[PDB]
C-alpha cells in the first residue's frame, strides 16, 4: 500500500512523529518548512535584475540586509518597494526603490520546503 501526504504538526518540545501504517517498507520522501538565516548572496551585474537563491522551493522572504561588522546592520531593504520574491527562486530588484551595488554581497533570510535526508536530517 502507498501512503502520501501523511500530515503531522511539528512541535519544538517533541521532535518525534509517528507513522500510521505499521509494516513500513521504505520512506519515499519527508518534506518540511525550514528557515534559513544569513545566506550570503552576490548581487548580479544587470541593474534591476534577478539574483538566484541557493534553494528553488522558497516562498517567503523574512529579511534582506547588509553588515560591515558581525551583528551591525548597515541597511535593511523594504519588501514591496525595494524588492519582491519572484518564481520562488529569486530576489527581484525591479521595484522603484534602493538596491545593493553591482557585484557586492548581502544577506537573505527566507523560508523554503526542504526534502529531508535520512541519516543527516
Amino acid at each position: 500500500g502507498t501512503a502520501e501526504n501523511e500530515s503531522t504538526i511539528f512541535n519544538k518540545s517533541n521532535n518525534s512523529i509517528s507513522l500510521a501504517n505499521s509494516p513500513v517498507k521504505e520512506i519515499r520522501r519527508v518534506t518540511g518548512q525550514v528557515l534559513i538565516e544569513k545566506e550570503r548572496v552576490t548581487r548580479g551585474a544587470q541593474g534591476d535584475g534577478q539574483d538566484f537563491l541557493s534553494n528553488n522551493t522558497a516562498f517567503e522572504i523574512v529579511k534582506v540586509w547588509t553588515e560591515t561588522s558581525p551583528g551591525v546592520t548597515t541597511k535593511e531593504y523594504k519588501q514591496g518597494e525595494d524588492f519582491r520574491l519572484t518564481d520562488g527562486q529569486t530576489i527581484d530588484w525591479s521595484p522603484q526603490g534602493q538596491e545593493p551595488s553591482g557585484g557586492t554581497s548581502y544577506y537573505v533570510s527566507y523560508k523554503y520546503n526542504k526534502r529531508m535526508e535520512a541519516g543527516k536530517d
Binding site: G44, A45, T68, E99, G102, G103, Y106, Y107
Partner: protein
C-alpha cells in the same frame, strides 16, 4: 596600471573594463565592503591596506619602545576658549598644518578647557587639504576619545594625548588638517588669537600670528568651513622614528614544574608567540616566573598599542580578515588564464594568500604555482602569479580576494597596488 589610479565605480550596472581588475586602495568604490569576510582598514595617504586591532590576566610592560617620539610642531600661545560647535549651542573645528619633509606622525597633542559628562566622547580625525586651501572629505585617521581620556585645565596646562591605531604618513609639502567632531554641546578648547592677552601671562599679548602656516576653521556641519585667520589652536604634533628592536616583559606570574616544557614549546619565532622569547626562573615550583618577549621593530608599528599597556591576552592575538573586490561580469570577455600581481609587506608571522572565484564567491580557488618575487623597496616585495586557471573551456566571471592574517598584534601585513589581468590562451 592606468585603471589602478581611476579610483571610482558606478553603483548600478557599471561599465567595467573587460579582462582587467585593479585596486589602488584610494576609495571604497572597488571593494565589496559588506562581504562577511571583509576586514581591512585603508590608509589613503599611503594607498595601502592593513588589519586593525580587534579585541576578539598577567599585565605586560613595554620596556624598550619600538619608536621614540619628538615634538616638531608646537603652538603654545593661548588667549581664549572656542566651543567645538559654535553654530549649534542652544540659546566642529579644525587646524591646518604642513611639513617640509616626509614625517611619520605618531600622536597629537590637544588642550581642552572643559568637557562633558562621563558618557560623552570626542571624535578626532586627520583630513586632507584641497587645492583651494580648505579641508576635504577624505579622512586619513580617526579615533574616539572618551571623557575620562580628555584632560581639562583652567590654564591650558593639561595636555590630552591622542593616539591612532595606524601611523599617519605626512608627505612633505602637502597640507593636512586636524578635525575635531563631537555631538555634545559642552566641549571647549583653548585657542590663541593675535593681539589678545595670554591666559597665564596677561602682561604679554600675542603680537604676531600664533602659527603662521596654519589657520583655525569652524563649521556647522563639518563640510563648509569658516576660516579664522588671526586664530590658531594650541596643539602639538609628535613625529616618531622607529628603532631596530622592541621588548616586552610580562609581570612575574599547567602544572608549574611541567608547564615550563609546554611554555618553551609554544613560545617560538614561528609559532603564535612570535616574539623571540626569554625567561627568568626562581626555583622550579615557584608561581613567581618572569617571561620576556622581543621582536624586530618597523615604521608601521601601531602608536596606540605602543602607548597602551598590554596583557598576555591582548598581546599574542591572531588578527585576521580579507580584502574582497566587487564581482566582475566577464560574459563578453571569457578567459582561462589569470595574471595575479600584488605587493605585500610580510613581517614575522604573517601571511597573504591570494584567491579568486569564477562563480560570484559560491566557491574559492587557490593558485598552484609559487609566485616570482621582485623587491620593490625595503619593506614591500612584489608577488606575481601567472597560471592557466582552467585547462579547457573559459570562465565568464571573476572575483578577486586577498586574505590577511597575523600571529600577534604588533606585527601586521600590508598590501598595495593590486592588479589582476586575465587572458584567453
Amino acid at each position: 596600471v592606468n585603471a589602478l589610479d581611476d579610483g571610482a565605480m558606478e553603483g548600478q550596472n557599471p561599465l567595467t573594463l573587460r579582462s582587467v581588475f585593479s585596486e589602488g586602495f584610494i576609495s571604497l568604490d572597488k571593494a565589496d565592503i559588506t562581504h562577511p569576510d571583509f576586514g581591512i582598514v585603508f590608509s589613503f595617504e599611503d594607498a595601502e591596506a592593513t588589519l586593525a586591532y580587534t579585541e576578539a590576566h598577567i599585565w605586560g610592560r613595554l620596556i624598550s619602545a619600538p619608536f621614540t617620539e619628538e615634538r616638531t610642531i608646537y603652538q603654545g600661545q593661548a588667549s581664549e576658549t572656542l566651543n567645538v560647535n559654535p553654530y549649534n549651542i542652544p540659546n566642529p573645528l579644525a587646524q591646518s598644518f604642513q611639513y617640509d619633509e616626509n614625517r611619520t606622525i605618531s600622536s597629537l597633542g590637544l588642550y581642552f578647557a572643559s568637557k562633558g559628562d562621563k558618557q560623552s566622547n570626542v571624535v578626532i580625525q586627520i583630513r586632507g587639504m584641497g587645492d583651494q586651501g580648505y579641508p576635504n572629505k577624505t579622512i586619513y585617521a580617526e579615533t574616539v576619545m572618551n571623557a575620562d581620556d580628555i584632560k581639562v585645565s583652567n590654564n591650558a596646562s593639561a595636555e590630552t594625548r591622542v593616539y591612532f591605531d595606524d601611523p599617519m604618513m605626512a608627505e612633505g609639502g602637502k597640507e593636512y588638517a586636524i578635525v575635531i567632531i563631537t555631538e555634545n554641546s559642552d566641549y571647549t578648547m583653548w585657542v590663541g588669537t593675535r593681539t589678545k592677552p595670554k591666559i597665564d601671562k596677561p602682561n604679554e599679548v600675542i603680537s604676531g600670528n600664533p602659527y603662521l602656516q596654519g589657520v583655525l576653521f569652524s563649521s556647522s556641519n563639518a563640510s563648509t568651513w569658516t576660516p579664522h585667520q588671526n586664530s590658531d589652536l594650541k596643539f602639538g604634533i609628535y613625529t616618531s622614528k622607529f628603532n631596530e628592536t622592541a621588548t616586552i616583559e610580562f609581570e612575574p606570574i599547567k602544572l608549574i614544574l611541567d608547564d615550563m616544557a609546554s611554555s618553551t614549546t609554544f613560545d617560538q619565532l614561528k609559532w603564535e608567540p612570535i616574539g623571540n622569547y626569554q625567561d627568568l626562573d626562581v626555583l622550579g615550583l615557584a608561581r613567581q616566573v618572569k617571561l620576556r618577549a622581543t621582536f624586530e621593530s618597523n615604521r608601521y608599528i601601531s602608536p596606540l598599542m605602543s602607548s597602551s599597556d598590554l596583557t598576555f591576552t591582548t598581546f599574542l592575538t591572531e588578527l585576521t580578515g580579507s580584502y574582497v573586490g566587487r564581482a566582475i561580469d566577464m560574459t563578453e570577455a571569457p578567459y582561462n588564464t589569470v595574471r595575479f600581481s600584488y605587493e605585500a609587506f610580510l613581517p614575522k608571522g604573517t601571511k597573504v594568500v591570494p584567491k579568486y572565484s569564477a562563480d560570484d564567491g559560491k566557491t574559492w580557488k587557490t593558485f598552484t604555482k609559487s609566485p616570482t618575487t621582485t623587491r620593490a623597496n625595503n619593506e614591500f616585495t612584489r608577488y606575481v602569479i601567472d597560471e592557466k586557471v582552467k585547462s579547457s573551456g573559459t570562465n565568464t566571471k571573476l572575483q578577486v580576494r586577498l586574505d590577511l592574517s597575523t600571529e600577534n598584534s604588533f606585527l601586521r601585513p600590508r598590501v598595495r597596488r593590486l592588479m589582476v589581468t586575465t587572458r584567453d590562451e
